[PDB]
Design a protein around this ligand. Structure first.
Ligand SMILES: NC(=O)c1ccc[n+]([C@@H]2O[C@H](COP(=O)([O-])OP(=O)(O)OC[C@H]3O[C@@H](n4cnc5c(N)ncnc54)[C@H](OP(=O)(O)O)[C@@H]3O)[C@@H](O)[C@H]2O)c1
Lengths: 248, 256
């Protein structure tokens, strides 16, 4: 790949990389030339994903349960046996009665902090003036647009994550660790598979999106690749919508 | 109190009103002519506050622990036997957790998110029936949530859970503003910088710490109680009637 977008010789980790947006990103980074580790809650499904993604580059699954402070140290430990450094961290592991709020806030915010905190040593092993280490957090336009629907825990959790990302960016910038947010609108995911399969329900749901369609997997891949590379080297603390104009 | 700022005949509830910013707001609304209830965990301290605040108008304490869903439900029930409507809800109860980045805290986060975000949602959720009984075209019911400039500014203190939790609060407030607007229920955020409270008293008593903290603020000083009171009153009255979804810093220019 052209040097603007090439990730050859870079080592990447994508949390929640076994399906949906995380998997779209992992495939892109592999296609760009990076070595890509992935992790998810389900170790078997994650290893199956890694195997399938091995048709695109060097991909390995690592066991991780990020919904705990022990889980974040375990991932850092397991990665450290496999690599001396980490160049690219993509935090996608997320989720969507107020009894469910505690869990939404845990996975979307706190677990991302813990994951970053424990990986700081090997991120610092990588970070330099010539090429900063990259942290890319997957947020949501639900954390910015007032046009929520239901799911009143989700939007606020992503806003917490966007703000956490901004604070980290500011603190880490002198250490040559860049922190940025991709803020997706609607993209294909097994959660909304029923909508995607039925053309009537698909176009009906796309009426809320100014572009009148869902995002494409290659759009997510493309953006993640550029953010991890030359296009993203001079940015930190950004929150970038990829959302069909929803945020307007 | 001039018609523009008068809250005479209005019924208010300030959560976390026993001390700090809650107390400043409670006194402010009382002086504006509002009938104001206050709630906190410490039953005795809250009752002592209400008595002290009774010098300004009809103030009454309702002890409540908002750190669970059941507590918000009880508060709604307790206020319901006391009043037939609620004109002004001020959501002030909140907390910080400060510790080194690379150390331990994870239980700190969970407590911070529950009070600053989740408990505020359930609070409004449980009180919507009283809010709707108040709400009309000629005068909307008012929700006022206390956020923080920590949720706006990237400038990191300690307390890595606090900023994000307050940002979640601001977004929640905006979403609720959009949904309830057609029912004549306005929802707005006051995002303070430094104000004197129990949480900050250690800085305030050390001349050196206070100097360095004041120097980090563009206006070079902490907020005054009367400034918080004036803004809360304004927001609850005519100045806030055509407002919803706003997040308004009162921070000495810290947001810049
Ligand atoms: N001070 C600042 O500079 C600043 C800046 C930005 C934002 N804030 C926010 O503004 C709000 C004001 O707090 P403060 O620090 O100024 O005053 P504070 O002295 O800390 O008192 C806060 C109030 O919250 C109540 N409270 C705590 N936990 C509760 C619970 N589980 N259920 C019901 N009530 C509870 C307290 O009652 P008890 O006494 O019984 O515990 C008290 O009345 C907070 O939400 C804070 O995060 C403050």
């Amino acid at each position: 790949m052209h040097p603007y977008f090439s990730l050859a010789g870079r080592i990447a980790l994508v949390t929640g990389g076994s399906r949906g947006i995380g998997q779209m990103i992992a495939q892109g980074l592999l296609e760009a030339g990076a070595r890509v580790f992935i992790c998810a809650r389900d170790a078997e499904a994650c290893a199956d994903t890694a195997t399938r993604l091995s048709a695109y580059g060097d991909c390995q699954a690592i066991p991780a349960d990020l919904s705990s402070e022990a889980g974040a140290r375990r991932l850092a430990q397991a990665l450290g046996e496999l690599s001396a450094r980490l160049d690219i961290l993509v935090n996608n592991a997320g989720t969507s009665p107020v009894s469910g709020w505690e869990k939404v806030m845990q996975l979307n915010v706190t677990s991302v902090f813990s994951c970053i905190q424990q990986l700081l040593p090997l991120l610092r092993r990588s970070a330099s003036a010539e090429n900063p280490a990259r942290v890319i957090n997957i947020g949501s336009v639900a954390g910015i647009s007032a046009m929520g629907e239901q799911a009143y825990a989700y939007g606020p959790s992503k806003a917490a994550l966007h703000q956490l990302s901004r604070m980290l960016a500011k603190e880490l910038v002198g250490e040559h660790i860049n922190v940025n947010v991709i803020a997706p609108g609607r993209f294909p995911s097994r959660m909304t598979r029923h909508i995607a399969n039925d053309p009537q329900a698909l176009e009906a749901d796309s009426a809320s999106i100014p572009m009148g369609r869902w995002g494409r997997p290659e759009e997510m891949a493309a953006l993640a690749i550029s953010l991890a590379g030359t296009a993203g080297a001079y940015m930190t603390g950004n929150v970038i919508p990829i959302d069909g104009g929803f945020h307007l």
